[PDB]
Design a protein around this ligand. Sequence first.
Ligand SMILES: Nc1ncnc2c1ncn2[C@@H]1O[C@H](COP(=O)(O)OP(=O)(O)OP(O)(O)=S)[C@@H](O)[C@H]1O
Ligand SMILES: Nc1ncnc2c1ncn2[C@@H]1O[C@H](COP(=O)(O)OP(=O)(O)O)[C@@H](O)[C@H]1O
Ligand SMILES: [Mg+2]
Ligand SMILES: [Mg+2]
Ligand SMILES: [Zn+2]
Ligand SMILES: [Zn+2]
Lengths: 438, 660, 662
Amino acid sequence: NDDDNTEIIKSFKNFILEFRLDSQFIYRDQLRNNILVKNYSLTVNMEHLIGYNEDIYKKLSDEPSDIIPLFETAITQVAKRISILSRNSLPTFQLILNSNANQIPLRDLDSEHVSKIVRLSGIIISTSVLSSRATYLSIMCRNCRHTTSITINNFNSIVSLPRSCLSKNCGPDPYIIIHESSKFIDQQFLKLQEIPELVPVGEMPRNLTMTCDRYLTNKVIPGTRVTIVGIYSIYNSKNSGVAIRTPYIKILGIQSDVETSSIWNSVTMFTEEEEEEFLQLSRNPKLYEILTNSIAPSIFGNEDIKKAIVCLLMGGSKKILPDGMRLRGDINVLLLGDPGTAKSQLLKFVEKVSPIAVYTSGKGSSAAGLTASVQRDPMTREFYLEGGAMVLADGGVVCIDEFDKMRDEDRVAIHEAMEQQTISIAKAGITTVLNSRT
Amino acid sequence: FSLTVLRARIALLATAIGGPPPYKLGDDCLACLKDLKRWFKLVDDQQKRWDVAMAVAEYRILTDDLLPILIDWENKCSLAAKLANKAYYDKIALNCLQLLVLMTWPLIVTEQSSSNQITLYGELKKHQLVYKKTILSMESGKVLRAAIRLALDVIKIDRLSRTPRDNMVLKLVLNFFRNVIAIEPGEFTINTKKSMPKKGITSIDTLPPNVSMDDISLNTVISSFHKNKVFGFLLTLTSSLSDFINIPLLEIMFYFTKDVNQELLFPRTSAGFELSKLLQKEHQMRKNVIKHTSARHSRFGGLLSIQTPDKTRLTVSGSQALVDEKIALQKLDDSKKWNKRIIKKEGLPNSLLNSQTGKAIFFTESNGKHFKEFINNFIDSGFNILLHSVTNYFTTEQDRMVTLEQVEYLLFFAWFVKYQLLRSKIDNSADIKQVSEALKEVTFILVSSLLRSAYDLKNWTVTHAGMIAFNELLNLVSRTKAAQDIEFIVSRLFSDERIQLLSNLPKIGSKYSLQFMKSCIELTHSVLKVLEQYSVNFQKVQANYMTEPVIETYINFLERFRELEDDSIKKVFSFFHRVFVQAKEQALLFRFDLIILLREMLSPDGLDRMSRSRKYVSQFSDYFLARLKKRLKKSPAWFVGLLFPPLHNSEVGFYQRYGE
Amino acid sequence: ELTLESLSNVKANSYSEWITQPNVSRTIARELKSFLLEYTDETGRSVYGARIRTLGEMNSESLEVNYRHLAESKAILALFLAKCPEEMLKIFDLVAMEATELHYPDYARIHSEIHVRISDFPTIYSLRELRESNLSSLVRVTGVVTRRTGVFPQLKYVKFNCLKCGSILGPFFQDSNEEIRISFCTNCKSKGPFRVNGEKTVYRNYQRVTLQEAPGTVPPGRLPRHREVILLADLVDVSKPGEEVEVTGIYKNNYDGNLNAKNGFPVFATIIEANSIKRREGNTANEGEEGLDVFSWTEEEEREFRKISRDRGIIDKIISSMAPSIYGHRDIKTAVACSLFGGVPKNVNGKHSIRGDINVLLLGDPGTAKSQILKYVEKTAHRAVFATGQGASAVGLTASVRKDPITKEWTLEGGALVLADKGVCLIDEFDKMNDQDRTSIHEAMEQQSISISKAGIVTTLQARCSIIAAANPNGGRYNSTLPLAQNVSLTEPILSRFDILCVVRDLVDEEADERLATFVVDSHVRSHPENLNARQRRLQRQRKKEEEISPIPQELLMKYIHYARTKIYPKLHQMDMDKVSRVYADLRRESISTGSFPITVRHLESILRIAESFAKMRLSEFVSSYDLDRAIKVVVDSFVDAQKVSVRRQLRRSFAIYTLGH
DNA sequence: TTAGAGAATTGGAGAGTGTGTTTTTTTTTTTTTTT
DNA sequence: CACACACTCTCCAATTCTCTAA
Ligand SMILES: Nc1ncnc2c1ncn2[C@@H]1O[C@H](COP(=O)(O)OP(=O)(O)OP(O)(O)=S)[C@@H](O)[C@H]1O
Ligand SMILES: Nc1ncnc2c1ncn2[C@@H]1O[C@H](COP(=O)(O)OP(=O)(O)O)[C@@H](O)[C@H]1O
Ligand SMILES: [Mg+2]
Ligand SMILES: [Mg+2]
Ligand SMILES: [Zn+2]
Ligand SMILES: [Zn+2]
């Protein structure tokens, strides 16, 4: 198997080195620029890989979990070649794929597509804390102190410590991990829920466990709509039929539309051309009319409400005085009036145009579900918080339709989160003051 | 691949013969019957596979197809026999019955047999029981009425006008009767290639779900025989004895009586009286059982110390021991978990060759009444004639007789000659001349020669087949002497040549089955009573009987008091009782084995208190203890010599065994 | 070469053993292939040829084989299937694959295997009447789905690799009920750990739904029994939780040590391996029908739909055939028909969304067949849910969250408006529900989406329902001298949602009373239970009774409605927007002055939605001028008839110029 | 036939491979239907 | 993880056996 693995590695190495569209080696330049800013990855488009040599794409799409580690090895070798002067300690690079294949609905992922590469869309509803998966596992024999090493690829087939002293018997399991010499990478578990417009008739939305890795972690926040290029894989969690297997997707590329954690990662990730476009737009003498006319274009009239919605979307300016007290910079708008005046349509449009938005109805909404819900962990028996509508919509706008139908004891919970913009919780031994700048 | 092709052919033949809902004979029915016969014959002996029979049983051919052929032919035969292509409609049943007897042939497995036969024996013995189960329950089992047609067609013509070919038809049809009734459950051949675990065999029931012990017992066979009129067939076949219809018939009417006792014939709400008596007996034994159990729970914690000699403080638990010191000593005895090794050991139709005394097949009262008269009618018809028919054949081919012939002949002879004498004893309506014809000199010398020849070849089963007849020889000699020179020629040849054979078997057969030991005690009891009316010397024949191994083999029978009956204990105890004053040889009786059995006898846990066995035994043991005390008080060394075996030294042999 | 007659004469003692015989298996396969290729019904067309054509056309993977057809011809095969389905289903699956390959060569590329869904099993049981005699035999239990696990891939052909010596183990078939046992390896007798091979392995879908005895069939006051049901590939996600279904499948049993330990007896655990599923929720009055889908139409049925739709006056026939056994009430029947067909749900550029379902409110005096019309609509509509008055809470109408008793976390389960998604929801006694329960359907009736943000579950379900509610005026009698708002306790926000508001009045007219009494007595005589074999003679009698009152048969009307709903989307290209604008302006002007019915823009869109429903009735793909004038007439009539009697004549005279022609 | 020299087999202690635990649903939130 | 249990793998001297002993 060494010869075939080396041939695959060399082929994808030549793909990295030789591919160019018009006078510019796209992937050589991208790899060097990524290395310069300590971004040990390579975002490889799939049309380019198909166009270069379709046999490589066929091999990749046949058995992705066995070929992708070889492609990561090829990327690492090219990185050493083009960023290290011959005559190391460079991490195994991560391959991030970009595809334009037809999106498979999240409910259509069935027995087939197992171990295949699937591209699908959904909305993230949960993001786990970062775990630690080992890659370099320095290991030492318990009895004879035979220190060796193990390298992990993290692409589960469908590895463990050796069950041998591997160089008196030393027992069946003579290996203990040396934790001061191992090298780890961070891994995050997501949870994808299908698009509300794609669920079948009379069906609840379906979740799907997902795993990020290295540079694809801390990339999305709950509530964001994403399209994922991943491997629909299988793992047998020990947690009720016979020979059943819990399915999950191993992410190889995430393409959100609302930026990364924070907004634009708490900073500006705007390409220079689009930043110049925004600057050109801001100088338009009729920018106010352009923005007003583009808020729910199908709603006739209601010019003043559209202007107020524009002001709400932009928001004020937050101030933090030296003495400590802060002044909120968010605008709250209430729309009273007769039925049939397109208030709910305006709310639904604002839920679309705003980068971060949550649409909730007043009737079906509770106080602990609007701000923060104290929940008991089924495994560890420990209480923890789960964010509500006013935490998911943090940094954005929450649209509370049918406001007057809220129970009197549920509408009160919004009082602090609207003005002070903090949610205070003292329940089950928890005492925190979260933030809701909505 | 060969096996599944064989299964395909069997299924192909199954759908070719035809079916129901009247059964229909398909096209080329005779051709397919001949093909099946040829295939089965080829795989039976020429190839020795025993796989075609398996496929036939699987398709339930014998039940679904073969039996309806004979059933449908029965009505046509009755119509043709009562009205006043008959040859074609007659020859069709011939092949069917030939197939039936071939499948019903008993299977024998030996060392020379290959692995396939022994492997499939356990899988085909159950199907063997299935055949007889479905045959007997098939609307009163009328297939035997069709079978007897396959014999009356040939026997109808004159015997001198017999056929050199049709003669085999009689053998083939006659073998079916003995084959169906010899079907018995086999043995679970445990795979002893490795040590067995801490648990034994789970189930010893070798019966498929369709087969129940109710529907396969010999009671069912006898009821089917009575309801199918075949009693008249068996009587008329014997009524015309005046060759080939003797050897099969020797076991055709013997299999159902090979192990059935004659005691059940006479009783000596009717069934409920014995039920009440058995409830009383089991209530008595359960009452004896609870005498050891504590009045309170086990965890009451009754602890005690026995101040045994040497001021020992041995601790034994149990509040029961606080009642009696003997109970404490018994709890001391059985507390040890260590045990020694006890050594231990049918190739022919099971019977006395392997049946304990309590294996009395349950019989319906009407069925018992019918069987009481059936065998009596057979005796009144052709018993001695049948014996004399095979006397000539028995005188020839002495070394050419397979071991099956002896076990199927001697047991028959002994059982029937015993039945005739017991029936004459209970009721005087039967003359002794009805069995006195067996006292022929040539028959007696030939059976004695066979008995003596079986000794040197270590054929213990064949020899046990001979003692059961030898007992009745002496019994009939006594009966014809008391109720009366013809008896002298039969009962004078055991002077010197035969004394060794009769006096050696008790000394050696004690290491074998219970019935082998039971035969010799009856032999000695009979021989000690036949000669009592003429005394060659009474004091000389008993001299060779008073030997230590003989006492050992007599006392080894007494250890089974949990199953010994009144007569079994009576004979063993009377052997010693009759020599108490007549022989005066009690010195050889001084082993601890007899004393411990006496302790067991008088204890309530042994013999019944309400019965008529423990009273005279208790009185005789009271005298035994007086004799023991008198003999032990006069010799201090005899206190410990009572345990050790006797000595071969000259002076002590008369000093201790006779007291000077 | 065995004939059908041999198949009936079992040779192997056991049936399963009889079926497993290669000759019997070949004979059965040949007979089943002949049945599939050559079975023809009364009308003469080959049923299963068309079924296989449709199967391949949509890559269905499942062949719906009626059990009555299998029983009528080659009844021995039907008996075998009903007695030992485990092997008969395999044989008949192979036969179905062969037939499909005959119609569609090289179909193995699309789907490797074709499953057979047996339908219309005669002997229907309940989860209480199952016994040990039904083990390993086809059953047709009926119950309501309670739980439903996710669709977990399951091992189909396990190919283990020996760890000690070997590297390949036989492709054992997983039975979906018990774990595959390896025991001693073939390469060496020594035992050790084993694990599967990821090289050559195929998976199948697996879902374990938990049937529970339906509250309708449970004896009153008794606890309901329940059995777990295994849904294998192509059957997953076909039964939503809370729905009522009829499950045909093998009733197998597997040994588990937990149950034996708990009960202390060598007792086994039973389970149903589903072979087909038919949902009976919302069509509980539809007994006597055949097939796994009452609303599925054959090609001939579609041709008949297209033939009758071209008729002039098909709309009138459809309207007159809504409540055939209910006299009069043509306005109510028109409104119900419009609601049943529904409108087209628009979506402008993906931003603006317009409701496409029509809501109807039946308000009137008692004993005017308002609840009976609702029961009929429940019988007819595809997905219908019935909820009444106080017996329908706020969260049971839309959606509720619960703490899962097994996994102990909050999960969201739908209510009436979700179980009736893309269907109809029927609310009897609308005015008697609690206000805080009635206000819970405001969003799902206009936005058609339920928004839940409780217990940390922030999500927006989809409920494209069409509410049909029967109300009752204040005091029990509709006072014609008062406006509509003074006769009901409902407010404007809930009154504006209903597109058509039909006011029913119970007046005393001797001619009307005579005609109604005659109709009711005739209907009571007709429906009397005491009023060429049994099946088609009974069907002929049913058709004879139906043709008296309903111009179009009901069993065909249901399929017609479903076909129009799922395959027609009329467009409003050719229209006179000036007429609709003028009608809307007049409606608002007369609403503000001398009126109380709220006329918002929703009542402008109601005209378009009703016009689209009328265009659907003719199966047309474009809304004609007649279909718009009829919608305008319906809306203005519903507006006018709800006004006080003082101003009704003036309003009718004012609006007469728009309904010119009728 | 007896006291005594030779073959022949297999059960009872022990080397060893793999097990089996401890191991938990209280109290506290959040929902929901009745009250 | 390790101490205790259940049990497969494995093994010589006391217990049985039959050829040559007295
Ligand atoms: N000015 C308008 N322009 C376009 N469409 C409108 C306008 N006013 C109303 N509509 C339509 O009328 C309907 C109004 O329904 P909604 O806006 O969802 O309910 P609402 O206006 O919030 O009144 P409520 O919620 O019952 S108080 C939608 O179909 C709108 O598209
Ligand atoms: N127009 C009608 N034609 C036939 N039957 C009618 C009509 N109106 C009422 N009925 C009969 O009245 C009975 C009761 O109707 P019901 O369902 O109580 O109406 P509501 O609930 O509005 O009072 C029904 O059995 C129905 O047959
Ligand atoms: Mg609204
Ligand atoms: Mg009503
Ligand atoms: Zn080591
Ligand atoms: Zn192996």
